[PDB]
Amino acid sequence: RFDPGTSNRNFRIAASDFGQALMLPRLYATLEETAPQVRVTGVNLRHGPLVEELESGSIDIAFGGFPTLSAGIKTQTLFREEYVCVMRQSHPALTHGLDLEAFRQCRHIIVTAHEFNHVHEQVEARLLELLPPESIRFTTENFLVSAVIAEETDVILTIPSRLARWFANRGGLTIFPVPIELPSIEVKQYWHERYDKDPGNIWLRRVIAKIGFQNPPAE
Amino acid sequence: RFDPGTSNRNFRIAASDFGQALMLPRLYATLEETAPQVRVTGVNLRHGPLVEELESGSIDIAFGGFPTLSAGIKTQTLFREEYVCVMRQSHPALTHGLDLEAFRQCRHIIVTAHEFNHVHEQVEARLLELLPPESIRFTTENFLVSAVIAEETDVILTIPSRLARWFANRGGLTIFPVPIELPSIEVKQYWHERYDKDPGNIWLRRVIAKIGFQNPPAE
Ligand SMILES: Oc1c(Cl)cc(Cl)cc1Cl
Ligand SMILES: Oc1c(Cl)cc(Cl)cc1Cl
C-alpha cells in the first residue's frame, strides 16, 4: 500500500542530465502539495543494460528515448522532440551567416550518447558522418555541459529544441535550423512489467503523465 | 611522440559536470591557436576505481578532488574552493534570511558525490547530518542539473562558489553563506605515474597549469 501524503519513498528516475533537469522541477509542486516526504532522485545513464535496473527496482522509471528497451518493459510516449542548432550571441558567424559548407568548417561540440543507448545516438552518428573530424573540438556526455560550453566559446552545438529554448530564453544562446535533415525523437517513460501493479510506481507514472513538458514548472 | 600544432589526439579528462564546464572553455583558445586538431572529451565520473582508468590510459587526466587517488598517482593542486548556498530570487526565505533553523526547514536539492568518491562527498555528508530527511526533496549526481532545478523551484542548493557566482549571472539565483561550518576543498589535476613522461600528457598538464580558473575563459 502506497499513500503519497505520508510516504517517505525515494523514487529513482534514470535520465540524461537534461532529462533530469526537465523532469524534476515539474514534479516539485505535486510533491509539495500532495507528497511532502517523497524524494525524487535523478540517476545518470550508465553503460549497463537499463532493463536490469528496472527489473531489480533500483530504477523506478526511465525517462528518455531508449530504443533497446522492449522485452519486459511497458511504455507511455510523452512527447516528440526536434533538433536545432545553437551558438552564442557573440559568435562571429552571425554577421554573415552560414551555408552548409561554412557550417561544416566551424568548430563543433558533440554530445555523445551511444554508450548509453539513448536515442540521441542517432543524431550523434549523423553529425560524425557529416562533419570533418578536425571540426569537432569538444565531446561530452552531458547536454547541460555542452550548452554552457557553447555559451562561452565559438562552438556550434546541435541539441533538442526544448534544451535550446531554455538557454535562449535566458539570453545566452541563439537558435538556428540544422542545415541537414535529422530524425525527430520520441520521449517516453518506461517501467518494468514487474512493477506495473505497484501502487507507488503507478502513482509516479500518473503524476508524470499529467506534466506539461512544453510549459514552465507549476507553482 | 607528440606535436600540438599537428596532433589529432583526443584527450579524455574525467571530471564532474561542473568540472568539465569549468575546464573545457578554458582550453578553447589554446586549442584554436596552438593545437587546432586536438580534441578534448569531458568524461563523467563513474562508480568504478578511477585509478584503473588512469592506469589503462582510458582517461588522460582527472580534474577535481579525489581523496582516494594516491598509490600510482601524481597530482598538482590547482586551486582552493569554498561553498555557498543559492536560492532563486523569488524564494520566500530571501527576505527572512538564511539562519540555520530557516535553512533546515527549507526544501533542498543535494548533489550526491559519495558514489564517485569526489570530495564534494564531504559537504554532502555534512548536509545529510544536519538536515531532517523530510527537508531533502531532490538528489542528483550533476551539479548543473541541480542549478537548473534551484533556478526553477524553491529548493536550496549548496555548491562551490565558482559554480554559484557564474551561474547566478544568467537567470536569477541569489547567493547566501551556508549557515553550517563547511571545509574548503582542493581542486587538482591527477595523472598516473605511468604517463608522467608521456609528451602528450605533459603538454596537456602544462596547459592546464597555465589556466586562470578564477577568470573567464580567454577570448
Ligand atoms: O534525455 C532527453 C529527454 Cl528525457 C528529453 C529531451 Cl527533450 C531530450 C533528451 Cl536528450
Ligand atoms: O568537480 C569540481 C571541480 Cl573540477 C571544480 C570545482 Cl570549483 C568544483 C567541482 Cl564540484
3-class SS string, chain A? CCCCCCCCCEEEEECCHHHHHHHHHHHHHHHHHHCCCCEEEEECCCCCCHHHHHHHCCCCEEEECCCCCCCCEEEEEEEEECEEEEEECCCHHHCCCCCHHHHHHCEEEEECCHHHCCCCHHHHHHHHHHCCHHHEEEEECCHHHHHHHHHHCCEEEEEEHHHHHHHHCCCCEEEECCCCCCCCEEEEEEEEHHHCCCHHHHHHHHHHHCCCCCCCCCC
Q: Do A32 and B138 touch (CB under 8 A)?
A: no
What range does the domain containing B127 cover? 83-183
Q: Which residues of B touch A20 (CB under 8 A)?
A: 140, 142, 145
A167 lies in the same domain as A89: yes
User: The C-alpha cell of A116 is what?
Assistant: 548509453
B114 lies in the same domain as B155: yes
A72 lies in the same domain as A87: no
The residue contributing the CA closest to ligand 2 atom 5 is: B19
A162 lies in the same domain as A113: yes
CATH number at residue B52: 3.40.190.10
- In 3D, which of A17, A119, A125 has the Cα closest to residue A68? A119
Q: Do A155 and B32 touch (CB under 8 A)?
A: no
CA-to-CA dists, residue B37 to A89, A132, B9, B14, B30, angstroms: 25, 10, 7, 20, 11
Number of independent structural domains in chain B: 2
Quoted resolution (Å): 2.0
The experimental method behind these coordinates is X-ray
Residue A13 pairs in a beta bridge with A42, A61
Classify the C-alpha dihedral A46-A115-A208-A212 as positive or negative: positive
Distance between CA atoms of residues A53 and A51, nearest Å: 6
- In 3D, which of B68, B61, B70, B179 has the Cα closest to residue B127? B179
Distance between CA atoms of residues A158 and A176, nearest Å: 10
B55 lies in the same domain as B120: no
Would you tell me how many other CB atoms lie within 10 Å of the CB of residue A27? 24
A157 lies in the same domain as A125: yes
Amino acid symbol at B138: F
- The answer to whether the beta carbons of residues A57 and A79 sit under 8 Å apart is no
A126 lies in the same domain as A216: no
CB burial readout B89-119, b (16+ within 10 A) else e: eebebeeeebeeeebeebbbbbbbbeebbbb
| Residue A16 CA to ligand 1 centre (angstroms) | 7
Q: Do B41 and A138 touch (CB under 8 A)?
A: yes
Distance between CA atoms of residues B12 and A116, nearest Å: 18
B127 lies in the same domain as B51: no
Distance between CA atoms of residues A59 and A41, nearest Å: 10
User: The C-alpha cell of A65 is what?
Assistant: 528515448
Q: Of A17, A133, A217, which is closest to B142 when you measure between CB atoms?
A: A17
- In 3D, which of B14, B11, B5 has the Cα closest to residue B118? B14
B190 lies in the same domain as B132: no
A143 lies in the same domain as A190: no
* Number of inter-chain CB pairs under 8 A, A vs B: 128
The residue contributing the CA closest to ligand 2 atom 3 is: B19
Classify the C-alpha dihedral A42-A46-A51-A53 as positive or negative: negative
A159 lies in the same domain as A102: yes
Q: Which of A37, A44, A143 to mutate to test the interface with B (most CBs of B within 10 A)?
A: A44
A138 lies in the same domain as A105: yes
